[PDB]
């Protein structure tokens, strides 16, 4: 039960913005300029680590 719960929580954590326009990398890349894309990607990386 615990080994399933931990993995389920880890998988579900991927759908959190942590503060950004969107929680999907492709939309951010195809929507904004590189100078703001760097900030968004840094925010997501700091969220997931």
């Amino acid at each position: 039960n615990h080994n399933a719960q931990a993995l389920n929580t880890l998988v579900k954590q991927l759908s959190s913005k942590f503060g950004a326009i969107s929680s999907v990398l492709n939309d951010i890349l195809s929507r904004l300029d590189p100078p703001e894309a760097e900030v968004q990607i840094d925010r997501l990386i700091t969220g997931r680590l």
């Binding site: 326009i21 195809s30 929507r31 904004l32 300029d33 703001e36």
Partner: protein, 48 residues
Amino acid sequence: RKRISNCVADYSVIYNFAPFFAFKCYGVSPTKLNDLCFTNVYADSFVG
């Protein structure tokens, strides 16, 4: 107020007028506008 929908816009010639006061285009950067879709576009006009 004018609503535009169900159409295709060039999104690149509308710059033929004079330069404006500012471009505070939040969200989408106003250079990568020809590649993404939207649901509906509005346009409101008035005269500090």
